[PDB]
Amino acid sequence: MKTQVAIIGAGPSGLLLGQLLHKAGIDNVILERQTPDYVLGRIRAGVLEQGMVDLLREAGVDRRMARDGLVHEGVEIAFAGQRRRIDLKRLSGGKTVTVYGQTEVTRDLMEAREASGATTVYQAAEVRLHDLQGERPYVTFERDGERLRLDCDYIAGCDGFRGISRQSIPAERLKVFERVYPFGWLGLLADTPPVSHELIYANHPRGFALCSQRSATRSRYYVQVPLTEKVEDWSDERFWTELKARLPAEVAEKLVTGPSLEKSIAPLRSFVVEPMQHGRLFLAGDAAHIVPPTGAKGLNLAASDVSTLYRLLLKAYREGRGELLERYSAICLRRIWKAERFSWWMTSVLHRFPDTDAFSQRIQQTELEYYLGSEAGLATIAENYVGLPYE
Amino acid sequence: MKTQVAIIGAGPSGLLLGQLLHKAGIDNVILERQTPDYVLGRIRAGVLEQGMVDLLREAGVDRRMARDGLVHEGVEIAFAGQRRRIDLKRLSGGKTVTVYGQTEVTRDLMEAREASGATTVYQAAEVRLHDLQGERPYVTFERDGERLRLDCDYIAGCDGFRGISRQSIPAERLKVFERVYPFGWLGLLADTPPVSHELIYANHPRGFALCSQRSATRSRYYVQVPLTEKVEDWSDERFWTELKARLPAEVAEKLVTGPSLEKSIAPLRSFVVEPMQHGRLFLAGDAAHIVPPTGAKGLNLAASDVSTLYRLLLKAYREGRGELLERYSAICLRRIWKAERFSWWMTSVLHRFPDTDAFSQRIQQTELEYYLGSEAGLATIAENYVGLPYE
Ligand SMILES: Cc1cc2nc3c(=O)[nH]c(=O)nc-3n(C[C@H](O)[C@H](O)[C@H](O)COP(=O)(O)OP(=O)(O)OC[C@H]3O[C@@H](n4cnc5c(N)ncnc54)[C@H](O)[C@@H]3O)c2cc1C
Numbered sequence: 185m186k187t188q189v190a191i192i193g194a195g196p197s198g199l200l201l202g203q204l205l206h207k208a209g210i211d212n213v214i215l216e217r218q219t220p221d222y223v224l225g226r227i228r229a230g231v232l233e234q235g236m237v238d239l240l241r242e243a244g245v246d247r248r249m250a251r252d253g254l255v256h257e258g259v260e261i262a263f264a265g266q267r268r269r270i271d272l273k274r275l276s277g278g279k280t281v282t283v284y285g286q287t288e289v290t291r292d293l294m295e296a297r298e299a300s301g302a303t304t305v306y307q308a309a310e311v312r313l314h315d316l317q318g319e320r321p322y323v324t325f326e327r328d329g330e331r332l333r334l335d336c337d338y339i340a341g342c343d344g345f346r347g348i349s350r351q352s353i354p355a356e357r358l359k360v361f362e363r364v365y366p367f368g369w370l371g372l373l374a375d376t377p378p379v380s381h382e383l384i385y386a387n388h389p390r391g392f393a394l395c396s397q398r399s400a401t402r403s404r405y406y407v408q409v410p411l412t413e414k415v416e417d418w419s420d421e422r423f424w425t426e427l428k429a430r431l432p433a434e435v436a437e438k439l440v441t442g443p444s445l446e447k448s449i450a451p452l453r454s455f456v457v458e459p460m461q462h463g464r465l466f467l468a469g470d471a472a473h474i475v476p477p478t479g480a481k482g483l484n485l486a487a488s489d490v491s492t493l494y495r496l497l498l499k500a501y502r503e504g505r506g507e508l509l510e511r512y513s514a515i516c517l518r519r520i521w522k523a524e525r526f527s528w529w530m531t532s533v534l535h536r537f538p539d540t541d542a543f544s545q546r547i548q549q550t551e552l553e554y555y556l557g558s559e560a561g562l563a564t565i566a567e568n569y570v571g572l573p574y575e
Numbered sequence: 576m577k578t579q580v581a582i583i584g585a586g587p588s589g590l591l592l593g594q595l596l597h598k599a600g601i602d603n604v605i606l607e608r609q610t611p612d613y614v615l616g617r618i619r620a621g622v623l624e625q626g627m628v629d630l631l632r633e634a635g636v637d638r639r640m641a642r643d644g645l646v647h648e649g650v651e652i653a654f655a656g657q658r659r660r661i662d663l664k665r666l667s668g669g670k671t672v673t674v675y676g677q678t679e680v681t682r683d684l685m686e687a688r689e690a691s692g693a694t695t696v697y698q699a700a701e702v703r704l705h706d707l708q709g710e711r712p713y714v715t716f717e718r719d720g721e722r723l724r725l726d727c728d729y730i731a732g733c734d735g736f737r738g739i740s741r742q743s744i745p746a747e748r749l750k751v752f753e754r755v756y757p758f759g760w761l762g763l764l765a766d767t768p769p770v771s772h773e774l775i776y777a778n779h780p781r782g783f784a785l786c787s788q789r790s791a792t793r794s795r796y797y798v799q800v801p802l803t804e805k806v807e808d809w810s811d812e813r814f815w816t817e818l819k820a821r822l823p824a825e826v827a828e829k830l831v832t833g834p835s836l837e838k839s840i841a842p843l844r845s846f847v848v849e850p851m852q853h854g855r856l857f858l859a860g861d862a863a864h865i866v867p868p869t870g871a872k873g874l875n876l877a878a879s880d881v882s883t884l885y886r887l888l889l890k891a892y893r894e895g896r897g898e899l900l901e902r903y904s905a906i907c908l909r910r911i912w913k914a915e916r917f918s919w920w921m922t923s924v925l926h927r928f929p930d931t932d933a934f935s936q937r938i939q940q941t942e943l944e945y946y947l948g949s950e951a952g953l954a955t956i957a958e959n960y961v962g963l964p965y966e
């Protein structure tokens with residue numbers, strides 16, 4: 185077969201690019217390793233920036249989101265006996281964040297694409313990339329057991345952290361920066377009504393906790409657990425017990441507990457690759473960078489990469505200005521690093537670290553006391569949380 | 576002999592307290608270990624906050640300062656090829672910092688006191704503190720070779736980091752927080768005209784540099800050097816060579832070099848003791864805390880401690896409300912920690928650290944790119960640099 189742009193990975197980064205492109209006339213083919221329902225099984229992301237929200241509207245898939253998504257004007261941070269709120273609306277120039285599950289986002293983009301008649305080959309195993317540096321690159325894969333050859337102009341590797349794309353670039357060409365945090369995130373999704381109309385982040389001597397939501401009758405809770413901990417040791421009972429222990433008395437007494445729909449441990453990591461392209465392969469999403477969930481940026485950065493890529497590809501296809509694709513990584517990384525600095529910061533001021541002396545602990549507490557009490561300090565968090573502008 | 580308040584250490588913290596108190600009627604005696612000219616030999620501090628400036632005016636010693644001190648509306652930070660200025664005036668609500676040497680400050684307070692006829696016993700060796708917890712505490716010392724006994728109501732330990740005061744409190748009662756940075760500051764005072772009307776802080780791959788001034792015809796320059804480095808290995812020649820290497824081309828070509836008047840290595844450290852008192856002994860200045868010079872806070876924190884102490888002592892002597900001295904450490908530490916968090920921050924974003932991976936370096940650069948480009952981020956530095964409000 186043949187096409188214009190070939191997309192690797194049918195996750196949010198890929199389907200968002202496939203949709204944007206289809207809607208602009210630029211044909212594309214999406215290849216996925218797993219089954220639609222497995223892709224749909226990932227709970228993952230819940231907090232979206234405004235830039236992403238508008239982007240979904242330009243992709244024409246926002247009906248459901250605008251009906252079920254909860255718009256949030258501010259968040260909360262709890263530490264040392266007191267709960268402190270951040271009014272994101274006034275402090276950010278009028279911006280806000282939308283709460284709407286990644287599972288939903290994917291479900292929506294997936295229906296959108298199914299309707300469009302655009303190509304989507306799931307269960308596409310043994311994906312290999314070829315001739316990235318030549319005028320004609322190609323992607324070969326196995327369907328059941330036959331080798332098929334897809335011919336394209338540009339390959340867009342949106343296949344996640346563990347994808348084949350980043351592996352397909354010569355190791356010497358890529359410089360990697362990575363930081364692994366000595367803790368994990370035990371996520372728990374319940375079909376209970378959330379404990380607060382807004383999110384609560386809590387720093388406690390036992391560790392980090394977070395109180396999220398998916399809707400009015402569905403909640404998402406996290407606690408900080410060591411990397412040697414296995415999900416099976418964590419029953420529903422003990423999770424609730426632990427969470428309650430890590431939150432404010434007034435917040436724990438309101439909490440409505442209940443059976444888990446999903447439970448799992450997300451290991452934290454920071455990762456950035458430089459650059460983000462090789463010949464005709466451009467990486468987008470987790471295929472290029474990972475940020476600790478603390479900041480709610482992964483999906484939101486994937487959107488900015490994708491936005492830049494669609495925009496640059498349009499300029500190259502219709503406007504015949506293919507030279508512009510060279511400044512991809514330059515544009516993206518700019519936003520990526522700033523996001524990463526906030527994600528690392530959020531993570532370092534809310535999590536308890538192993539083997540921390542008395543001085544750093546005092547600095548952490550003060551980091552919170554200052555940034556949550558200074559009007560200039562609240563702002564820095566506010567504008568970073570709603571998200572910095574796409575360049 | 577006998578008195579009301581006895582002050583240990585005739586440095587800026589002590590003479591500022593002795594002056595404030597004398598001017599309010601509360602008699603005090605100052606004991607110093609060294610000679611006036613040795614105390615006068617310390618180059619140390621050069622940047623003063625507005626709170627301190629007004630405090631000197633209330634102490635009546637500000638004629639000279641208001642004539643020779645240079646008022647600064649903004650500073651500069653240089654990193655990665657570009658120089659970035661921070662307009663402290665607009666960004667801080669209209670505040671600014673004054674450039675005036677500590678040697679001068681001390682010279683001024685010393686003349687002030689000499690004129691006042693108030694007691695000052697230099698070369699007071701073998702100082703020992705007694706009965707801190709009783710109604711009557713006392714301080715004994717040797718003058719030439721005779722043991723003298725000074726009787727007082729309250730002892731004010733303003734004797735610096737290595738003073739006898741902090742040593743005189745039961746170790747179990749004090750909790751210490753300390754951080755030693757793996758680098759030092761090679762200071763150089765020249766009688767040459769400064770390279771910029773405002774201060775330049777520079778982060779460079781060789782290390783930190785800083786371009787200060789004492790007046791229009793006197794400059795103070797610093798470079799970052801390892802702790803194993805001795806001042807004698809650092810000749811004038813090589814210092815200038817090194818400095819030039821660490822600064823912007825456009826700034827290095829304007830630089831007027833010249834012979835050193837003073838040269839020495841200041842080792843960086845962070846130190847806070849909790850609490851700051853014991854019975855009738857209250858610590859103030861470096862006797863209670865040390866902050867890395869990067870932020871220009873040591874002297875300025877000593878002033879806030881002193882201000883609080885004078886104020887509380889007045890309330891106790893004339894107003895007969897001695898119960899109020901119990902909230903000393905509570906009030907002080909509040910400001911102290913916030914200052915320390917900024918001092919540590921300044922130090923971590925401008926200095927090159929040994930054994931830093933690729934990720935932290937990228938985070939440092941981004942820390943600078945964000946805070947120096949965000950209007951909310953510039954503000955956080957601005958208000959912290961001019962100094963937070965005395966409570
Ligand atoms: C617990 C958790 C919470 C989070 N919360 C937030 C939040 O609130 N807000 C936020 O903004 N971010 C958050 N994030 C991040 C966000 O989930 C991810 O950034 C996002 O899933 C990445 O989108 P992507 O399309 O690049 O990657 P992916 O979601 O990784 O999907 C990539 C697809 O590629 C497929 N694939 C892999 N290899 C191949 C191959 N060889 N060929 C073909 N297909 C392949 C995979 O099966 C997968 O389907 C969170 C992450 C976690 C773990």
Ligand SMILES: Cc1cc2nc3c(=O)[nH]c(=O)nc-3n(C[C@H](O)[C@H](O)[C@H](O)COP(=O)(O)OP(=O)(O)OC[C@H]3O[C@@H](n4cnc5c(N)ncnc54)[C@H](O)[C@@H]3O)c2cc1C
Nearest residue numbers: 584586588608619620621622734735860861871873874875
């Ligand atoms: C290179 C450098 C640059 C700096 N720059 C700045 C700046 O720009 N701005 C700023 O705000 N801060 C700065 N600081 C800090 C500032 O210099 C100090 O915080 C300040 O000197 C402390 O005042 P003090 O009165 O507590 O201590 P001290 O200056 O330490 O004086 C204490 C006195 O106690 C005496 N003494 C000691 N033991 C005894 C004893 N047993 N009995 C009697 N006397 C005793 C000592 O001889 C000394 O005279 C800088 C510091 C350094 C090292």
